[PDB]
Amino acid sequence: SNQNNFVHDCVNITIKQHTVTTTTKGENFTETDVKMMERVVEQMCITQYERESQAYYQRG
Amino acid sequence: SNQNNFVHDCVNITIKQHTVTTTTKGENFTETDVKMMERVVEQMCITQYERESQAYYQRG
Amino acid sequence: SNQNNFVHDCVNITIKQHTVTTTTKGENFTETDVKMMERVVEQMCITQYERESQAYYQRG
Amino acid sequence: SNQNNFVHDCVNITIKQHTVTTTTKGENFTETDVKMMERVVEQMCITQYERESQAYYQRG
Amino acid sequence: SNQNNFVHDCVNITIKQHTVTTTTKGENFTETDVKMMERVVEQMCITQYERESQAYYQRG
Amino acid sequence: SNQNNFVHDCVNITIKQHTVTTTTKGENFTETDVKMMERVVEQMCITQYERESQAYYQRG
Amino acid sequence: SNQNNFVHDCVNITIKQHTVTTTTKGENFTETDVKMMERVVEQMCITQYERESQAYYQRG
Amino acid sequence: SNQNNFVHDCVNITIKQHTVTTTTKGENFTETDVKMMERVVEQMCITQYERESQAYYQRG
Amino acid sequence: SNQNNFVHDCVNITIKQHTVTTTTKGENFTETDVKMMERVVEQMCITQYERESQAYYQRG
Amino acid sequence: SNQNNFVHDCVNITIKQHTVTTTTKGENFTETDVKMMERVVEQMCITQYERESQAYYQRG
């Protein structure tokens, strides 16, 4: 019973909360951001499988 | 019973909440953002399978 | 009983909530965004299968 | 009993809520957006199967 | 009992809610959007099957 | 040109306004009184003119 | 040209306003009184004129 | 040109305003009194004119 | 040109304002009094004019 | 040109203001009094004019 496994998980995130409360009372507010997840992933993942394979990354 | 597996998961996210409360009381508010997920993924994933394969990434 | 598997999951997201409450009481509000998911995915995924295959990415 | 599988899932999203309440009481509101999903997917996925195949992406 | 499968799912979304309430009481409202899904998908998916196949994407 | 004067003014009130504005906006109000004059005078004035005259006051 | 004067002014009040504004905005109000004059005068004035005159006051 | 004067002014009040503004914004108010004049005068004035005159005051 | 004057002014009050502003913003208020004149005068003035006159005052 | 004057002024008060501002912002207020004049006068003035006159005062 042969079995090969080639697993690739570039990103893996897990949030588990039970109670999330937020309050923004006040009088004079300007430019209020109450986000929860802004910019999570900005990745690159290739997973090449054979020879003479190349990969060029640049984030200038 | 041979079995090959080639799994590729570029992004994997899991949120599990039970109670989410938000409140924005006040008098003079300007430019209020109460988002929850703004820009999650901006990725690139290729998964090439054979030889002389190339990949060029650039995020200038 | 041979079996090959070539799985590719570029993005995978799961939200599970039970109670979501939001309130925006007040007097003078201007430009209020109460969105929940703004810009989730902006990706590119190719999954080439044979040789001399190329891929060019650019996000200038 | 041979069986090949070539699965490709470019995007996969699942929301499961039970109670969603929203309220926007007030007096003077201007430009209020209470959307839930604004711009989910902006992707490109190809899945080429043979040789000398190319793919050019550009998001200038 | 041979069986090949070539599955391609460019986008897959599932919403399951039980109670959705919305209220927009007030006095002076201007330009109120209470949409639920604004711009879901803006994609392109090709699934070419043979050699010397090309694909050019541009979102300037 | 004789002239006698026996003036008696028990109460004398004078209101002179130009603009009176009132507003009772809201959501959940209970037992709101917006009167202007509730119980002005509760007096007693006699002005007896001859001898062995008596006056008995009691506000128990 | 003889002239006698016997003036008696028990109470004398004069209000002179130009602009009176009132506002009672809110959400949950209970037992709100916005009166202007509640219990002005509770007096007693006699002005007896001859001898052996008596006056009995009691505010128990 | 004889002239006698017997002036008696038990109370004399004069209010002169130009702009009166009042505001009671909020969320949860209970037993709010915004009166202006509650209990002004509670007096007693007699002005007896002849002999063996008596006056009894008691504010128990 | 004889002239007698017997002036009696038990109380004499004069208010002269130009701008009166009041504000009671908040969230949880209980038993708020914003009166302006609560209990001004509680007096007694007699002005007897002849002999063997008596006056009894008691504020127990 | 004879002239007698018998002036009696038991109390004499004069307020002259130009701008009166008051503010009571907050969250949890209890038993707030913002009065301006609470208990001004509690006097007794007699002005007897002839002999064997008596006056009894008691403020127990």
One DSSP character per residue, A9-58 reads ES--EEEE-S-EEEE---SEEEEEE--SEEEEE---B----STT---B--
Q: Do I58 and J54 touch (CB under 8 A)?
A: no
DSSP G56: B
Q: How far apart are CA F10 and CA J44, in angstroms?
A: 19
- CA nearest G34: which of J20, B27, I36, H19? I36
Which structural domain, as residue segments, surrounds residue A19?
A: 1-51
In whole angstroms, how large is the CA radius of gyration of chain C?
22
Q: How far apart are CA J34 and CA I36, in angstroms?
A: 8
| Cβ atoms G34, H34 nearer than 8 A | yes
- Residue at J58 is within a domain: no
| Cβ atoms E9, D41 nearer than 8 A | no
Q: Is C22 exposed, middle or buried (0-12, 13-18, 19+ CB in 10 A)?
A: buried
Q: How far apart are CA J54 and CA J52, in angstroms?
A: 6
E49 by DSSP, 3-state: which?
Answer: coil
Chains in contact with chain F (at least 3 beta-carbon pairs closer than 8 A):
G
Query: What single-letter amino acid sits at J12?
Result: N
Q: How far apart are CA E51 and CA C52, in angstroms?
A: 10
Which CA distances in Å does H16 have to G17, H13, I51? 6, 10, 42
- Residue at H39 is within a domain: yes
DSSP D51: T
Q: After which residues is chain B broken (C to N over 2.5 A)?
A: none
Q: Is the dihedral of CA F37, F42, F43, F44 positive or negative?
A: positive
Pairs of CB atoms within 8 A across C/D: 200
Q: How far apart are CA H37 and CA H47, in angstroms?
A: 27
B57 by DSSP, 3-state: which?
Answer: coil
At F26, list the tokens: 């809201």
| Cβ atoms G9, H12 nearer than 8 A | yes
- CA nearest D12: which of B14, C5, B17? B14
- Residue at A16 is within a domain: yes
| Cβ atoms E11, E42 nearer than 8 A | no
**Phi/psi of residue F8, nearest 5 degrees:** -140, 120
Q: How far apart are CA B25 and CA J27, in angstroms?
A: 12
CB atoms within 10 A of CB J18: 9
At F58, list the tokens: 């009691």
At I1, list the tokens: 């040109």
Looking at the DSSP bridge assignments, the partners of residue B13 are A13, C13
User: Left (φ > 0), alpha (ψ -120 to 50) or beta: where does D51 sit?
Assistant: beta
DSSP I13: E
Residue of chain E nearest D16, judged by CA positions: E16
Q: How far apart are CA F34 and CA F11, in angstroms?
A: 25
- Residue at H26 is within a domain: yes
Looking at the DSSP bridge assignments, the partners of residue I39 are H39, J39
Element (H, E) at E29: strand E28-33
Looking at the DSSP bridge assignments, the partners of residue G30 are F30, H30
Sheet-wide strand order for H28-33: F28-33, G28-33, H28-33, I28-33, J28-33
Distance from CA of I34 to the nearest CA of H (A): 5
DSSP E42: -
Which CA distances in Å does G36 have to A15, E39, H38? 58, 56, 8
Q: How far apart are CA H9 and CA E57, in angstroms?
A: 96
At J57, list the tokens: 């005062």
Among the partner residues H3, H35, H47, nearest to I3 by beta-carbon distance: H3
User: Left (φ > 0), alpha (ψ -120 to 50) or beta: where does G40 sit?
Assistant: alpha
Residues of J in contact with I60 (CB under 8 A): 58-60
Looking at the DSSP bridge assignments, the partners of residue E22 are D22
- Residue at E60 is within a domain: no
D40 by DSSP, 3-state: which?
Answer: strand
Q: How far apart are CA F40 and CA F43, in angstroms?
A: 9
| Cβ atoms H51, I53 nearer than 8 A | yes
Looking at the DSSP bridge assignments, the partners of residue A42 are none
At I36, list the tokens: 């302006």
| Cβ atoms G6, I5 nearer than 8 A | no
Report the DSSP pairing between strands E20-23 and D20-23.
parallel
- Residue at B59 is within a domain: no
Q: Is the dihedral of CA A33, A35, A37, A41 positive or negative?
A: negative
C8 by DSSP, 3-state: which?
Answer: strand
- Residue at I20 is within a domain: yes
Residues of G in contact with F20 (CB under 8 A): 20
The domain tally of chain H equals 1
- Residue at H38 is within a domain: yes
Q: Do G8 and F4 touch (CB under 8 A)?
A: no
Mutation for testing the B interface, residue in C1, C2, C6, C25 having most B CBs under 10 Å: C6
Q: How far apart are CA H46 and CA H56, in angstroms?
A: 10
Q: Do A32 and B28 touch (CB under 8 A)?
A: no
DSSP F56: B
Residues of H in contact with G16 (CB under 8 A): 15-17
At B57, list the tokens: 């990434």
